[PDB]
Amino acid sequence: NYSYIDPTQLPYDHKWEFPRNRLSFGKTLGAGAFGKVVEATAQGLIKSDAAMTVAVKMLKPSAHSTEREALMSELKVLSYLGNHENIVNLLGACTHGGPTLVITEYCCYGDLLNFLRRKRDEFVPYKKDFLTLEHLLSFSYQVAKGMAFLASKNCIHRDLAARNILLTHGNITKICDFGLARDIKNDSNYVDKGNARLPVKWMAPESIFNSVYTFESDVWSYGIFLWELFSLGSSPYPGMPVDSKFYKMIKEGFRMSSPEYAPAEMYDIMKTCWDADPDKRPTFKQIVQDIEKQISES
Ligand SMILES: COc1cc(Oc2ncnc3cc(OC)c(OC)cc23)ccc1CC(=O)Nc1cnn(C(C)C)c1
């Protein structure tokens, strides 16, 4: 389940331990078959008496031992990564006295995909809260920064997509992973492939055909995320169902054409992210340096 690191071998700093009786649960932000993310109020998480809104990931009673081990591994990985500006930040956890609760910072504007879809009509390519090309380039940069950080920590996301990016204050995007808190059975972006329901349209050929996930396969999905970003939340390979013809076309070298709002130099990034040879793909660090140059020129 993890390519380079082994989360079961990662420690869990009890500095994160928070008493669950100090959490007041609110609305469900997202839910899957086995897990959910709930909005909560954490009393006494701040040094003063002040309460704060947090997001809490937990398992449902439908969950088995596999999901239980997975939520604990996720907590260890989040604790191991530590705080990064572009990654959703762990604030605490509840491991004693009941089911595992993973507590993170609450992100004001939800997932990037829904935000882009809500802002599709209030978009200005030129430089109320109008979305612009400057915002999209900044989101692309922040996601590449967060992913460069994850790769430096020998972490592979395996599900990089606009649906797994959160938007908070000051146009700050944060990489997250809904995982078990996403209803993948009813999400048309996850296809039935063998025993699994997989996000095939975001997946590198080697992940589809050989089940290999690497730094380079995350780069491929970043290319797809770029496409979704500069199409303002449109589904990738539009009008194309995931079938035999799709797998054939990907293996044969078919690639999406540029989305409507992508600068040529961003599309250049996408093309290289989609190289059939993983060794010819750029690293996230190379991508950061490229976008940085584009922002400076702008
Ligand atoms: C509590 O934990 C989570 C909470 C999440 O959801 C939200 N978190 C904050 N604010 C939200 C605001 C919303 O609307 C206002 C919201 O509306 C649907 C969901 C929100 C999403 C994911 C997780 C776990 C997680 O990211 N784990 C993980 C594993 N690996 N990584 C690596 C670093 C990539 C991250």
Swiss-Prot record:
Binding site for ATP: 30-37, 57, 105-111, 163
Effect of D183I: In MASTC; somatic mutation; constitutively activated; requires 2 nucleotide substitutions
Modified residues (Phosphoserine): S188, S258
Residue numbers bearing the Phosphotyrosine modification: Y2, Y4, Y190, Y267
Domain of life: Eukaryota
Cytoplasmic side: 1-298
Positions contributing to Mg(2+) binding: Y2, N164, D177
Region (Important for interaction with phosphotyrosine-binding proteins): 2-4
Positions in coiled-coil regions: none
Active site per database record: D159
PTM info: Ubiquitinated by SOCS6. KIT is rapidly ubiquitinated after autophosphorylation induced by KITLG/SCF binding, leading to internalization and degradation.
Start and end residues of each Protein kinase domain: 23-298
Expression triggers: Up-regulated by cis-retinoic acid in neuroblastoma cell lines.
Further remark: Numerous proteins are phosphorylated in response to KIT signaling, but it is not evident to determine which are directly phosphorylated by KIT under in vivo conditions.
Function: Tyrosine-protein kinase that acts as a cell-surface receptor for the cytokine KITLG/SCF and plays an essential role in the regulation of cell survival and proliferation, hematopoiesis, stem cell maintenance, gametogenesis, mast cell development, migration and function, and in melanogenesis. In response to KITLG/SCF binding, KIT can activate several signaling pathways. Phosphorylates PIK3R1, PLCG1, SH2B2/APS and CBL. Activates the AKT1 signaling pathway by phosphorylation of PIK3R1, the regulatory subunit of phosphatidylinositol 3-kinase.
Disease implication from the record: Piebald trait: Autosomal dominant genetic developmental abnormality of pigmentation characterized by congenital patches of white skin and hair that lack melanocytes. Gastrointestinal stromal tumor: Common mesenchymal neoplasms arising in the gastrointestinal tract, most often in the stomach. They are histologically, immunohistochemically, and genetically different from typical leiomyomas, leiomyosarcomas, and schwannomas. Most GISTs are composed of a fairly uniform population of spindle-shaped cells. Some tumors are dominated by epithelioid cells or contain a mixture of spindle and epithelioid morphologies. Primary GISTs in the gastrointestinal tract commonly metastasize in the omentum and mesenteries, often as multiple nodules.
Assembly, per entry: Monomer in the absence of bound KITLG/SCF. Homodimer in the presence of bound KITLG/SCF, forming a heterotetramer with two KITLG/SCF molecules. Interacts (via phosphorylated tyrosine residues) with the adapter proteins GRB2 and GRB7 (via SH2 domain), and SH2B2/APS. Interacts (via C-terminus) with MPDZ (via the tenth PDZ domain). Interacts (via phosphorylated tyrosine residues) with PIK3R1 and PIK3 catalytic subunit. Interacts (via phosphorylated tyrosine) with CRK (isoform Crk-II), FYN, SHC1 and MATK/CHK (via SH2 domain). Interacts with LYN and FES/FPS.
Entry's family note: Belongs to the protein kinase superfamily. Tyr protein kinase family. CSF-1/PDGF receptor subfamily.
Name listed for the protein in its UniProt record: Mast/stem cell growth factor receptor Kit
Organism: Homo sapiens
Covered range of the whole protein: 567 to 931 of 976
